[PDB]
Write a protein that binds this ligand. Structure first.
Ligand SMILES: *C(=O)[C@H](C[C@@H]1CCNC1=O)NC(=O)[C@H](CC1CCCCC1)NC(=O)c1cc2ccccc2[nH]1
Ligand SMILES: *C(=O)[C@H](C[C@@H]1CCNC1=O)NC(=O)[C@H](CC1CCCCC1)NC(=O)c1cc2ccccc2[nH]1
Lengths: 301, 301
């Protein structure tokens, strides 16, 4: 066995979620050591959302204006600061459940798990991918801001995303744990286009390699193609151009299955030019691109 | 917002997973209080898998033949017992991270989160549904046995599934936390048919209600139908018969959206009789049935 979207265990992150209240606005924060990270638009009221001056708004706020609650515990704020679009509230007590972590800015096409939280309490976890346009197709309601995306390797939690806002198309935009927005998006109430949503070609191929491993093989053909020939049939369907680095990324899967990478591209070429004819690949009627060449290997071990 | 499969936070369950070793076989166990639950086929060697006599095999095992490790900790077994197809290893130390739990046998059509574990360490979490044929379409490799499915309500963890084996069709079969297999499946190495895989009609309708909430509305029509008329067009496509209880289950969503239940059935009837014509509903090209009328409400709050 089976194959399906699988998220990392959320235990390591549940212990770092807290409630942040700045006046009327309430959202979630990340408690790591003696610091709490949250979106900086907490200081925004209701009439300061079109084009707020976070510098001026932050000057009118003091330490006692921020209330952090790790459950029923009350953390004291002994210092605040604004790094890019994130607020760093220095607290007096260090999180006793702080895991080995690190802030990383993922690349477009990589996956990560999201722990959706409301009022500081986790609600659910699901897998997401950093779309080429630097957006994420997630599920967030009002109050979900502050939720983070993370990757768990061995025992080190790698935080890479913090939710900030939604876009008119329904997709979501956020920043890394250093306050740097992913994409050209800004934290101001205004319509912002995310751009054309391209398909992660390398992930689709990895999803096809996982298919041949699980028994789905009807798409395999007697055909082959060149890298330039495939990229020409991929630009028409809005597929990211496949590079030689992508081929080497899929190397382990190729030798694992015995199907050359360029042969997989030939199968994908026909799928894009002729559809699926009602068939199903790993239980899906469409080509999935949110499975990296690394999620398949760790799930098809 | 957005809509997608979302699992419960796995923190409460990660603290209850342990490694169980009975000779050469090694799998996962559930540590709750001073008892460890695991599949009873741990006592099986390699030549006792076709039709093993668990009574006789268990008589040849003593307490010191079972080794439990909660990470690097070593739990002592002071008593063992066999309840149905599950082993209850009484340990000397009670789990300090035991959450408020309860063993429940879910019904066909209900959903639950699965925490896939290998060697006692959690690997990932994903949402699953109890198929009408009493199987689950999950993702398990060798050593995944002992992993459990759970539902988290407020602060009470409701365990409802423990993985035992895979079927020839790739689907998986397991038991409740009392050792009772879901379906007519038995824990013996033999080909076992799971039966026709019916579609959870009530879940598909709830998935359509969630669609209208998120903006997907092209499937809504000027048509309506009767309950018997819909059930007749559903038996041909292997859809579970819709009952009045199902209608009342969808009541809150109906009043929430203003679309009568029988009107939704009319839209589903055309979708089954005419397909999707290449469109997409909530990012899917097929009709999803693993979203209960209760997962949509808690995700579309
Ligand atoms: C965080 O708590 C929410 C998350 C939203 C709620 C609905 N779904 C989500 O993903 N964030 C917001 O509501 C932001 C708050 C703003 C405060 C002032 C600074 C900018 C962010 N707003 C938006 O997400 C927002 C505003 C807006 C205007 C026009 C089109 C879309 C749009 N989205
Ligand atoms: C648990 O550790 C595994 C889980 C499997 C491994 C591959 N994917 C899974 O979901 N369980 C097994 O391997 C069982 C072990 C048996 C021990 C003796 C008692 C019965 C279970 N076996 C099977 O899952 C199994 C045997 C078998 C024979 C014929 C067709 C299918 C089939 N599946």
């Amino acid at each position: 066995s089976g194959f399906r979207k699988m998220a990392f265990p959320s235990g390591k992150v549940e212990g770092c979620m807290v409630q942040v209240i700045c006046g009327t606005t309430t959202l979630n924060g990340l408690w790591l050591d003696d610091v709490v990270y949250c979106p900086r638009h907490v200081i925004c009221t209701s009439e300061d959302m079109f084009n707020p001056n976070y510098e001026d708004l932050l000057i009118r706020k003091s330490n006692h204006n921020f209330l952090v609650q790790a459950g029923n515990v009350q953390l004291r704020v002994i210092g605040h600061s604004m790094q890019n679009c994130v607020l760093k509230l220095k607290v007096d007590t260090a999180n006793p459940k702080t895991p080995k972590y690190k802030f990383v800015r993922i690349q477009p096409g990589q996956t990560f798990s999201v722990l959706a939280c409301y009022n500081g309490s986790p609600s659910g976890v699901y897998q997401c991918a950093m779309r080429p346009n630097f957006t994420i197709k997630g599920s967030f309601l009002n109050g979900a801001c502050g939720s983070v995306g993370f990757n768990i390797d061995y025992d080190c939690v790698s935080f890479c995303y913090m939710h900030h806002m939604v876009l008119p198309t329904g997709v979501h935009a956020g920043t890394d744990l250093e306050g740097n927005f992913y994409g050209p998006f800004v934290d101001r109430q205004t319509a912002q286009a995310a751009g054309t949503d391209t398909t992660i070609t390398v992930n689709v191929l990895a999803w096809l390699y996982a298919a041949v491993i699980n028994g789905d093989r009807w798409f395999l053909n007697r055909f082959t193609t060149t890298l330039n020939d495939f990229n020409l049939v991929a630009m028409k369907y809005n597929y990211e151009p496949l590079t030689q680095d992508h081929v080497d990324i899929l190397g382990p899967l190729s030798a694992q299955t015995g199907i050359a990478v360029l042969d997989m591209c030939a199968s994908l070429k026909e799928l894009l030019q002729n559809g699926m004819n009602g068939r199903t690949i790993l239980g899906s009627a469409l080509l999935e691109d949110e499975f990296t060449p690394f999620d398949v290997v760790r799930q098809c071990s």
